[PDB]
Amino acid sequence: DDAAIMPSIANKKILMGFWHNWAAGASDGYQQGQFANMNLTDIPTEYNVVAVAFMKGQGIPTFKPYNLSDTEFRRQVGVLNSQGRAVLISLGGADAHIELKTGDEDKLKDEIIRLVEVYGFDGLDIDLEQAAIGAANNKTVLPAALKKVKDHYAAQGKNFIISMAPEFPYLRTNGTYLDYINALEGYYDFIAPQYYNQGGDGIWVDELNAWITQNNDAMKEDFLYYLTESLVTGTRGYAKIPAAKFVIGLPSNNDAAATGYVVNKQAVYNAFSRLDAKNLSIKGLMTWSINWDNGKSKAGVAYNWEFKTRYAPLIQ
Ligand SMILES: [Ca+2]
């Protein structure tokens, strides 16, 4: 039963991407482009962590493939798992109506385990929208349910992966989101903050006497390096996340996010080598999204896996 395997992502860097569980409209992109619809088995093998978007819903959130039978979806997850590639279910996204109630910890654990058994998922990504981070009892019920799920699979010899994809400004000192990170200390495998869609947010870098915003293309390398350094050291107004458990999240192209797209690939290569030189090597890259990475612009130009082609060599 290949889908039953939970691939290990230890001892290597990852190239993680999100896969959309809904059909493309005519112009969903931030520049009116269109994303590609595809099977999981159409995803380039270089994407070794695929996060399925999204588990959502009032009461106990859930997930069902929008266009594949459960059997066929599990078969495809099994193909990826046979290749050593992990497939996570991502809880959240826009308009998810996630409002967990105290007392629903075991019901949420049971539904996560059901999704693993039905679809072959290897873990869960937390991608809550801003309205959900402090909603209802999400703060306590979600970490409690996940610890139970992790413990359940660890008893079977399996590592159920837990990841989080916070907007980067969620991670400043005294941030309400830090409660999730602290509650899951020793349970989460990595945190992949979104270095996009917050164009006006920035950091003051004394080393350059410069204010660098997330929408500054001229200084993109320094934005990637210094926001990462701040996050993995707990400086410049940010709380600390261990570098070995840290992943930089980027838009695959300008249709995938309003701002944040890295125009010059060398900015990423250099940010990584600079972190490596300071013994701050990180876990890899995440992108929104795989469907966008093979989509097309408004003018019909194919993105043709630009993100995967630019950065897979860095990861492997
Ligand atoms: Ca699996």
CSV table of C-alpha atoms and ligand atoms in Angstrom, one decimal:
chain,number,residue,atom,x,y,z
A,1,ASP,CA,0.0,0.0,0.0
A,2,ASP,CA,2.2,2.9,-1.2
A,3,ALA,CA,0.0,5.7,0.1
A,4,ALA,CA,0.3,4.3,3.6
A,5,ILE,CA,4.0,5.2,3.7
A,6,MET,CA,4.9,8.6,5.3
A,7,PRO,CA,8.1,9.7,3.5
A,8,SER,CA,10.9,11.0,5.6
A,9,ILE,CA,12.1,14.6,4.8
A,10,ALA,CA,15.0,14.5,7.3
A,11,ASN,CA,18.6,14.8,6.1
A,12,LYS,CA,17.8,16.9,3.0
A,13,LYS,CA,16.5,20.3,2.0
A,14,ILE,CA,13.0,20.6,0.5
A,15,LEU,CA,11.3,22.3,-2.4
A,16,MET,CA,7.7,22.6,-1.2
A,17,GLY,CA,4.8,23.8,-3.3
A,18,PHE,CA,1.1,24.2,-2.9
A,19,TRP,CA,-1.4,22.3,-5.1
A,20,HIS,CA,-4.9,23.9,-5.7
A,21,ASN,CA,-7.9,21.6,-5.0
A,22,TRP,CA,-10.2,23.8,-7.2
A,23,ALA,CA,-10.6,24.6,-10.9
A,24,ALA,CA,-8.9,27.5,-12.6
A,25,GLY,CA,-11.1,30.4,-13.6
A,26,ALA,CA,-10.3,32.6,-16.6
A,27,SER,CA,-8.2,35.2,-14.7
A,28,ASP,CA,-7.4,34.3,-11.1
A,29,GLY,CA,-3.9,35.7,-11.1
A,30,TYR,CA,-2.8,39.0,-9.6
A,31,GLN,CA,-1.9,40.1,-13.2
A,32,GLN,CA,-5.0,38.4,-14.6
A,33,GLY,CA,-3.2,35.3,-15.6
A,34,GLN,CA,-4.6,31.7,-15.3
A,35,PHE,CA,-3.2,28.8,-13.2
A,36,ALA,CA,-3.0,25.2,-14.5
A,37,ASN,CA,-5.3,22.4,-13.4
A,38,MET,CA,-3.2,19.2,-13.0
A,39,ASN,CA,-3.1,15.7,-11.3
A,40,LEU,CA,-0.7,15.2,-8.5
A,41,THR,CA,1.2,12.8,-10.8
A,42,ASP,CA,1.8,15.7,-13.2
A,43,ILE,CA,3.9,17.6,-10.6
A,44,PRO,CA,7.7,17.7,-11.4
A,45,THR,CA,9.5,15.3,-9.1
A,46,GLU,CA,11.7,18.1,-7.8
A,47,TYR,CA,8.8,19.3,-5.7
A,48,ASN,CA,9.4,16.8,-2.8
A,49,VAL,CA,6.8,18.3,-0.4
A,50,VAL,CA,3.3,19.0,-2.0
A,51,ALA,CA,0.8,20.8,0.2
A,52,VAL,CA,-2.9,20.3,-0.8
A,53,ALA,CA,-5.0,23.4,-0.5
A,54,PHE,CA,-7.2,23.3,1.6
A,55,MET,CA,-8.9,21.5,4.5
A,56,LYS,CA,-11.6,23.9,5.6
A,57,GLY,CA,-15.1,24.2,7.0
A,58,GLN,CA,-17.3,25.1,10.0
A,59,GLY,CA,-17.5,22.6,12.8
A,60,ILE,CA,-14.7,20.1,12.1
A,61,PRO,CA,-12.9,21.2,9.0
A,62,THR,CA,-12.5,18.6,6.2
A,63,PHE,CA,-11.4,17.9,2.7
A,64,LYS,CA,-12.6,16.2,-0.4
A,65,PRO,CA,-10.9,16.2,-3.9
A,66,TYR,CA,-12.8,18.5,-6.2
A,67,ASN,CA,-12.4,16.3,-9.3
A,68,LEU,CA,-10.9,12.9,-8.4
A,69,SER,CA,-12.5,10.0,-6.7
A,70,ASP,CA,-11.1,9.2,-3.2
A,71,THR,CA,-9.5,6.0,-4.6
A,72,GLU,CA,-7.8,7.8,-7.5
A,73,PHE,CA,-6.6,10.6,-5.3
A,74,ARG,CA,-5.1,8.1,-2.8
A,75,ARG,CA,-3.5,6.1,-5.8
A,76,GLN,CA,-1.7,9.4,-7.0
A,77,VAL,CA,-0.5,10.2,-3.4
A,78,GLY,CA,0.8,6.6,-3.3
A,79,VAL,CA,2.8,7.3,-6.6
A,80,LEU,CA,4.4,10.4,-5.0
A,81,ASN,CA,5.1,8.6,-1.8
A,82,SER,CA,6.8,5.7,-3.7
A,83,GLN,CA,9.1,8.4,-5.1
A,84,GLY,CA,10.0,9.6,-1.5
A,85,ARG,CA,7.8,12.7,-1.9
A,86,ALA,CA,5.5,13.8,1.0
A,87,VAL,CA,2.0,15.1,0.4
A,88,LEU,CA,0.5,17.3,3.2
A,89,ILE,CA,-3.0,18.5,3.7
A,90,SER,CA,-3.0,22.3,4.3
A,91,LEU,CA,-5.6,23.5,6.8
A,92,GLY,CA,-6.8,27.1,6.2
A,93,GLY,CA,-6.8,29.4,3.2
A,94,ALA,CA,-9.1,32.3,2.5
A,95,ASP,CA,-12.8,32.0,3.6
A,96,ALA,CA,-12.2,28.7,5.4
A,97,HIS,CA,-14.6,29.4,8.3
A,98,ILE,CA,-12.3,27.5,10.7
A,99,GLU,CA,-13.7,28.1,14.2
A,100,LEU,CA,-12.7,25.2,16.5
A,101,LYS,CA,-14.5,24.9,19.8
A,102,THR,CA,-12.9,23.8,23.1
A,103,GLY,CA,-13.8,20.1,23.5
A,104,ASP,CA,-13.4,19.3,19.9
A,105,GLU,CA,-9.7,18.2,20.1
A,106,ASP,CA,-10.4,14.4,19.8
A,107,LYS,CA,-13.0,15.0,17.0
A,108,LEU,CA,-10.4,17.0,15.0
A,109,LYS,CA,-7.7,14.4,15.7
A,110,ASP,CA,-10.1,11.7,14.4
A,111,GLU,CA,-10.8,13.6,11.2
A,112,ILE,CA,-7.1,14.2,10.5
A,113,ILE,CA,-6.5,10.5,11.0
A,114,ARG,CA,-9.4,9.8,8.7
A,115,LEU,CA,-7.9,12.0,6.0
A,116,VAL,CA,-4.5,10.1,6.3
A,117,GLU,CA,-6.2,6.8,6.1
A,118,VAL,CA,-8.5,7.7,3.1
A,119,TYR,CA,-6.1,9.9,1.1
A,120,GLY,CA,-2.6,8.9,2.2
A,121,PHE,CA,-1.6,12.3,3.5
A,122,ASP,CA,1.8,12.5,5.3
A,123,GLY,CA,1.2,15.5,7.6
A,124,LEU,CA,-0.6,18.8,7.9
A,125,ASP,CA,0.4,22.4,7.0
A,126,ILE,CA,-1.2,25.2,9.1
A,127,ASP,CA,-2.1,28.1,6.7
A,128,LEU,CA,-4.7,30.0,8.6
A,129,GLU,CA,-6.1,33.3,7.1
A,130,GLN,CA,-5.7,36.4,9.3
A,131,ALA,CA,-9.3,36.2,10.5
A,132,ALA,CA,-8.7,32.6,11.8
A,133,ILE,CA,-5.5,33.0,13.8
A,134,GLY,CA,-7.3,34.2,17.0
A,135,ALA,CA,-10.8,32.9,16.2
A,136,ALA,CA,-12.9,30.8,18.5
A,137,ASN,CA,-10.6,28.3,20.3
A,138,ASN,CA,-8.3,27.7,17.3
A,139,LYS,CA,-5.3,28.6,19.4
A,140,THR,CA,-5.7,25.7,21.8
A,141,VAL,CA,-7.7,23.0,19.9
A,142,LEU,CA,-5.5,22.9,16.9
A,143,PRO,CA,-2.1,22.4,18.7
A,144,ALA,CA,-3.8,19.9,21.1
A,145,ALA,CA,-5.3,17.8,18.2
A,146,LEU,CA,-2.0,17.9,16.3
A,147,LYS,CA,0.0,16.7,19.2
A,148,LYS,CA,-2.4,13.7,19.5
A,149,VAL,CA,-2.1,12.9,15.8
A,150,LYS,CA,1.7,13.2,15.9
A,151,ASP,CA,1.9,10.9,18.9
A,152,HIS,CA,-0.5,8.4,17.3
A,153,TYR,CA,1.7,8.0,14.2
A,154,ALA,CA,5.0,8.1,16.1
A,155,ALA,CA,3.7,4.9,18.0
A,156,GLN,CA,3.4,3.3,14.5
A,157,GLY,CA,7.0,4.2,13.5
A,158,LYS,CA,5.7,7.1,11.2
A,159,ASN,CA,6.6,10.8,11.3
A,160,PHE,CA,3.5,12.8,10.7
A,161,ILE,CA,4.9,16.1,9.3
A,162,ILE,CA,3.6,19.4,10.8
A,163,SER,CA,4.4,22.7,9.0
A,164,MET,CA,3.1,26.2,9.2
A,165,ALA,CA,2.9,28.9,6.5
A,166,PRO,CA,2.4,32.2,8.4
A,167,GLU,CA,2.4,35.6,6.8
A,168,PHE,CA,5.8,37.0,7.9
A,169,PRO,CA,4.5,40.0,10.0
A,170,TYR,CA,2.7,37.4,12.2
A,171,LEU,CA,6.1,36.5,13.5
A,172,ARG,CA,7.2,39.8,15.2
A,173,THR,CA,7.9,39.9,18.9
A,174,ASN,CA,4.5,39.7,20.9
A,175,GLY,CA,2.7,38.4,17.9
A,176,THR,CA,-0.5,36.5,18.6
A,177,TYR,CA,0.6,33.7,16.1
A,178,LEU,CA,3.7,32.8,18.2
A,179,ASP,CA,1.3,30.9,20.5
A,180,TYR,CA,1.0,28.2,17.8
A,181,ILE,CA,4.7,28.0,17.4
A,182,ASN,CA,5.3,27.8,21.1
A,183,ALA,CA,2.5,25.3,21.7
A,184,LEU,CA,4.0,23.1,19.0
A,185,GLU,CA,7.7,23.3,20.1
A,186,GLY,CA,9.2,19.8,19.3
A,187,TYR,CA,6.3,18.8,17.2
A,188,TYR,CA,6.5,21.0,14.1
A,189,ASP,CA,9.0,20.0,11.5
A,190,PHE,CA,9.4,23.4,9.8
A,191,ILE,CA,7.9,26.9,9.5
A,192,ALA,CA,7.7,28.5,6.0
A,193,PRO,CA,6.8,32.2,6.3
A,194,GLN,CA,5.2,33.9,3.2
A,195,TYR,CA,7.7,36.6,2.0
A,196,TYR,CA,4.9,38.0,-0.2
A,197,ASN,CA,1.6,39.9,-0.2
A,198,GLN,CA,2.9,42.3,2.5
A,199,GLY,CA,4.6,44.7,0.1
A,200,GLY,CA,4.8,47.6,2.4
A,201,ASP,CA,6.1,45.7,5.5
A,202,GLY,CA,9.9,46.0,5.9
A,203,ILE,CA,12.9,45.8,8.2
A,204,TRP,CA,15.5,48.3,9.3
A,205,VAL,CA,18.9,46.9,8.7
A,206,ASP,CA,21.7,48.7,10.5
A,207,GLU,CA,24.4,47.0,8.5
A,208,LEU,CA,23.1,48.9,5.4
A,209,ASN,CA,21.5,52.0,7.1
A,210,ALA,CA,18.6,50.9,4.9
A,211,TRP,CA,14.8,50.3,5.3
A,212,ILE,CA,14.1,47.3,3.1
A,213,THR,CA,10.5,46.5,2.1
A,214,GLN,CA,9.2,43.2,0.8
A,215,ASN,CA,8.3,44.9,-2.5
A,216,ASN,CA,11.8,46.4,-3.1
A,217,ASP,CA,13.3,44.6,-6.1
A,218,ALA,CA,16.6,46.6,-6.1
A,219,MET,CA,17.5,45.2,-2.7
A,220,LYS,CA,15.7,41.8,-3.0
A,221,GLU,CA,18.8,39.8,-2.0
A,222,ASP,CA,19.3,41.8,1.1
A,223,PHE,CA,15.6,41.6,2.0
A,224,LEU,CA,15.7,37.8,1.7
A,225,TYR,CA,18.9,37.5,3.7
A,226,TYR,CA,18.2,40.0,6.5
A,227,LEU,CA,14.5,39.0,7.1
A,228,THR,CA,15.7,35.4,7.3
A,229,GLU,CA,18.7,36.3,9.5
A,230,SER,CA,16.3,38.2,11.8
A,231,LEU,CA,13.9,35.3,12.0
A,232,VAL,CA,16.4,32.6,12.7
A,233,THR,CA,18.3,34.7,15.4
A,234,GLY,CA,15.3,36.5,17.0
A,235,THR,CA,16.5,40.0,16.1
A,236,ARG,CA,15.2,43.2,14.4
A,237,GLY,CA,11.9,42.9,16.2
A,238,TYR,CA,11.2,39.2,15.3
A,239,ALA,CA,10.9,36.1,17.5
A,240,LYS,CA,13.4,33.3,16.8
A,241,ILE,CA,12.7,30.1,14.8
A,242,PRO,CA,15.5,27.5,14.5
A,243,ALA,CA,17.3,27.9,11.1
A,244,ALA,CA,17.3,24.1,10.6
A,245,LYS,CA,13.5,24.2,10.7
A,246,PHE,CA,13.1,27.3,8.6
A,247,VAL,CA,11.8,27.6,5.0
A,248,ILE,CA,11.6,30.8,2.8
A,249,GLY,CA,8.2,31.0,1.1
A,250,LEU,CA,8.1,32.8,-2.3
A,251,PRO,CA,5.5,33.5,-5.1
A,252,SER,CA,6.2,31.3,-8.2
A,253,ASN,CA,5.6,34.4,-10.4
A,254,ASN,CA,3.8,37.7,-10.5
A,255,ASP,CA,0.4,36.2,-11.1
A,256,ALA,CA,0.8,34.0,-7.8
A,257,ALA,CA,1.1,37.0,-5.4
A,258,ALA,CA,0.6,40.8,-5.6
A,259,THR,CA,4.1,41.5,-4.5
A,260,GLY,CA,7.2,39.4,-3.5
A,261,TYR,CA,8.2,37.7,-6.7
A,262,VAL,CA,11.9,37.4,-6.9
A,263,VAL,CA,12.9,38.8,-10.4
A,264,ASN,CA,16.6,37.8,-10.2
A,265,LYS,CA,17.3,34.2,-9.2
A,266,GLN,CA,20.7,35.0,-7.9
A,267,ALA,CA,19.1,36.9,-5.0
A,268,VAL,CA,17.9,33.5,-3.6
A,269,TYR,CA,21.2,31.7,-4.4
A,270,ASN,CA,23.1,34.4,-2.6
A,271,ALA,CA,20.8,34.6,0.4
A,272,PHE,CA,21.3,30.9,0.9
A,273,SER,CA,25.1,31.0,0.5
A,274,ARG,CA,25.3,33.9,2.9
A,275,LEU,CA,23.2,32.1,5.5
A,276,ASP,CA,25.4,29.0,5.0
A,277,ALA,CA,28.5,31.1,5.7
A,278,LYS,CA,27.1,32.2,9.0
A,279,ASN,CA,26.2,28.6,10.1
A,280,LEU,CA,22.5,29.7,9.5
A,281,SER,CA,21.7,27.2,6.8
A,282,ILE,CA,18.0,26.7,6.4
A,283,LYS,CA,15.7,23.9,5.4
A,284,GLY,CA,14.7,24.9,1.9
A,285,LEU,CA,12.1,26.8,-0.1
A,286,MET,CA,8.3,26.9,-0.3
A,287,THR,CA,6.2,28.4,-3.1
A,288,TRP,CA,2.6,29.5,-3.8
A,289,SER,CA,2.2,27.6,-6.0
A,290,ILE,CA,2.7,24.6,-8.2
A,291,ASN,CA,-0.5,25.4,-10.3
A,292,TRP,CA,0.9,28.9,-10.8
A,293,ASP,CA,4.4,27.6,-11.7
A,294,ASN,CA,2.8,26.0,-14.8
A,295,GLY,CA,0.2,28.6,-15.5
A,296,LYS,CA,0.2,31.3,-18.1
A,297,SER,CA,0.1,35.1,-18.1
A,298,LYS,CA,-2.7,37.2,-19.3
A,299,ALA,CA,-0.8,37.6,-22.6
A,300,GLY,CA,-0.6,33.8,-22.9
A,301,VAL,CA,3.1,33.3,-22.0
A,302,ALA,CA,3.7,29.9,-20.3
A,303,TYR,CA,5.4,30.1,-16.9
A,304,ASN,CA,6.7,26.6,-17.7
A,305,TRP,CA,8.0,25.7,-14.3
A,306,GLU,CA,10.2,28.7,-13.9
A,307,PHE,CA,10.4,28.5,-10.1
A,308,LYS,CA,11.2,24.8,-10.1
A,309,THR,CA,13.8,25.2,-12.8
A,310,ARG,CA,15.4,28.2,-11.1
A,311,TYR,CA,15.7,26.8,-7.6
A,312,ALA,CA,15.7,23.0,-7.7
A,313,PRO,CA,19.5,22.9,-8.1
A,314,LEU,CA,19.9,25.0,-5.0
A,315,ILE,CA,17.8,22.5,-3.0
A,316,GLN,CA,19.2,19.3,-4.3
B,1,CA,CA,1.3,8.6,2.8
